[model samples]
Target chain A: DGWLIIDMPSDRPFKQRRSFADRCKEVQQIRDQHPSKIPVIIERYKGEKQLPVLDKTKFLVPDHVNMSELVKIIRRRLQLNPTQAFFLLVNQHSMVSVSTPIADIYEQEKDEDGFLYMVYASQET
Target chain B: DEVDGWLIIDMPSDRPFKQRRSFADRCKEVQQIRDQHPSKIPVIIERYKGEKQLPVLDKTKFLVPDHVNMSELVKIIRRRLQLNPTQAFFLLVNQHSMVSVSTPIADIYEQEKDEDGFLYMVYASQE
Candidate 1:
């Protein structure tokens, strides 16, 4: 019950309630998963590299989905092979590792339209 | 991998990601130091909602010094959980996502760790 290091809001009192889990099973709550689903925009990088059936695209993904999983989704959409490397970059030209959750980057990087913008740099090495 | 770890070339990359100087330029020194080296510390990693359980480490604590990344933490967690390397884990705090292995625990601790100095972990399947 006391292993976590969290900053209290200074005004609220709390702990993880196991009973909430009990109630959740007995009743349905009207809410998305915390962090929720968000819109993302993926554009092909540096142009010329075209995915067979996909282009600058918009889609919904849970905020918690990691870049590795996202890569799988994009790779499948583009029908790419396992050996191909999909390098994703944000606005800063900084690479996002496959292990990074999109939301972690999203908090600091979503655009004005509320879309997480990423560009793909495809490779085979 | 030079003396005092000046040229601590990483296994995956070759680069020196800094210097020494006067205390008057302390802020600059801090920034330089921030970008330069790693310091070690103890952290608590208690889990929730995962299938398997990790044996209680030294009081659910770990001694992690500087330079080890988050991916390594996940690897350790996996090894303890007896999960296959390919079986991924989602390690988060409270409910928010923590950036993966590249993030330093020191930074996370400095920025938002609770009063107890612990980093709570939640593991969920990434399947």
Candidate 2:
């Protein structure tokens, strides 16, 4: 049976923490409190010394990280089994970013109230 | 575990003549009625657009940005309905639509629109 899981954020603001080390510590605290909880993972350009410095309005995903890296990141965060993880990525773009132009890249689908719901269903194994 | 029943009220379609009037017209009428009548009277005017057709295309659906989803619709419903995360999640999945509940809880009813544009409500005790 499929069960619905609500994603609730911990009381701490992990993203706004001063450093990556502090953010990681917050994740550990959350994990300690709620075992088996999944943490939200942010993907950045590979080989960069720090968070990329670019115009926020126009910045795009750098080419260093390949599709496989995104798949790996998603799987790691989602904790899906290997087969399920691979299939999920196959259904949608391996690399997705907030700035990506969804209309140009993929077809859009909306829910009843005119809210878009991105669909990516895995095929049966 | 306790199983609490939910009351799902579907919005009515094809409202009555007064309810079908335009918002501006309804407001004008209410003002007139208030001025003419000596006693205080509560008046309500409902505006509804009969079932609009949705496109079959994939790209034109109601596309909301991921970042906006959590803050806007989801959070608004949680605050207005006083529902916990679990209850809200269940309502979101089961209804597959957004619902706004009025204060002073009333009966649960569903409104169905027929091909000819008639509207009626079916009341349910529990769901």
Candidate 3:
């Protein structure tokens, strides 16, 4: 008999599973519930092979928190070492500077769905 | 080290540019530069204090266009250093955090410019 394979959580990116209008409504509701936080969706890069898949994808980041602090949180989530090369790509494009506040990135890069999207990957030195 | 006749100046003193220049002088200098070129953001790029791998840049001062994004500056720095694709390079703003490369220099300058009006950035590599 052939082995049965289970699909990983990353089988589909977040946007594929949810419609833009639905996502917008959900984020609006979330913001209403928690006026102080920003809704964010973080996923693994499709081509990423080394880093482990994050246990959770949805996050409610505080507006005051900066990207540097978020990096530490994700690093701990992945249990990566200090020397490990970790990158958090904004909208699957460029690495945002660490000192930038969550609110700043959200204001500029938030999608039509009202949530900020990010992807994480690593490379060797 | 020389890269294509471009001398990379590794300053002997570990002190940062701000430390060498008086605070008032830095403020006046930035004001003058901004007055002349209102569209550009004044920046200071330095090697991280404890950085051991990367060489110091010949010039610490930069007058970057507001429209240029962080990655554009990063590519310029990478080329200046003549680093290989495999080698790791990181640029930190305010000597602490990295920014998205797509973010415009103006956006970063607006939020993170020093009191003296210069945007401070430091570079480093993992050991």
Candidate 4:
């Protein structure tokens, strides 16, 4: 079977970890790799113009990582002041509350493009 | 269809009123239809502090499919509440923790869901 190829790792910080192809191979190597380890990407919704980017526009994430953990990643890359609170939205349609697994979302709900879209807004809490 | 679990949402009012309604009036309505059946899940309208009366939604408790993800629920809330695109709402669980839209009800059930089932606290943002 031909391997899945990707132009993954456009994000600079994550480039050192593993290329998208390498991770896919890791999954391709192991059938149903750890649910959290499943490779997925979070894209900023095209319509959002304001939120500070957490990292490379696209970065690889494991499936099982919860929103509690995922927000930390986004928080670090933010350009906002400390008082600003960020609201995380998925598919630009609903908020990513808590307990939801990142990977499950990608596999179960990602759009036809197979990429998960996340957009954020900041307001004083 | 024999779904796996349920979401116990404690909602505030979804309607806009010229004068705030009293809390007793809201509870009076739910208790009237109280399911004497022991096993039925209840939709509780949460009471907020100092606010004796909060607005109420048309629905209290609902049964959902076993594997329904969080996104669908979000859609349902949006439509049910008449939330416009510019409006935002917050749904919190387990100590008012914010929930992800893609999160499945099953996930919450497995974690901190209460015995009667998980409790959902919804809030309409004041913009």
Using lDDT, give the best candidate's number.
3
lDDT of model 2 at position B71? 29
Q: Best DockQ goes to which candidate?
A: 3
Docking class of 4: incorrect
True contacts kept of 4: 0.00
In candidate 4, residue A25 scores what lDDT?
Answer: 60
Candidate 1 regions exceeding 4 Å error are: A1-35, A50-56, B1-127
Deviation from native of the Cα of residue A3 in model 2, angstroms: 47
TM-score for each of the candidates:
0.37, 0.18, 0.53, 0.37
Looking at model 3, give its docking quality level. Answer: incorrect
Q: How far does residue B14 in candidate 2 sit from its true spot (Å)?
A: 11
Query: Model 1: C-alpha RMSD to truth?
Result: 20.7
Report DockQ per prediction, comma-separated.
0.02, 0.02, 0.07, 0.03
How many backbone collisions does model 3 have?
8
lDDT of 4 by residue, A68-119 (tens): 6777777777755665566766654465545777766667666443445566
Interface RMSD of 1: 9.3
lDDT of 1 by residue, A35-115 (tens): 377566665654424443364366678777888877888878877876455556665244555788888877778754355
lDDT at B9, model 3: 90
- Select the stronger candidate by DockQ from 2 and 3: 3
lDDT of each: 0.54, 0.31, 0.83, 0.52
Cα lDDT tens digits for candidate 3, B11-127: 778678899999899999999998999999999998887677678787778889999999899888887778777767788786355566778999999887898888999888852
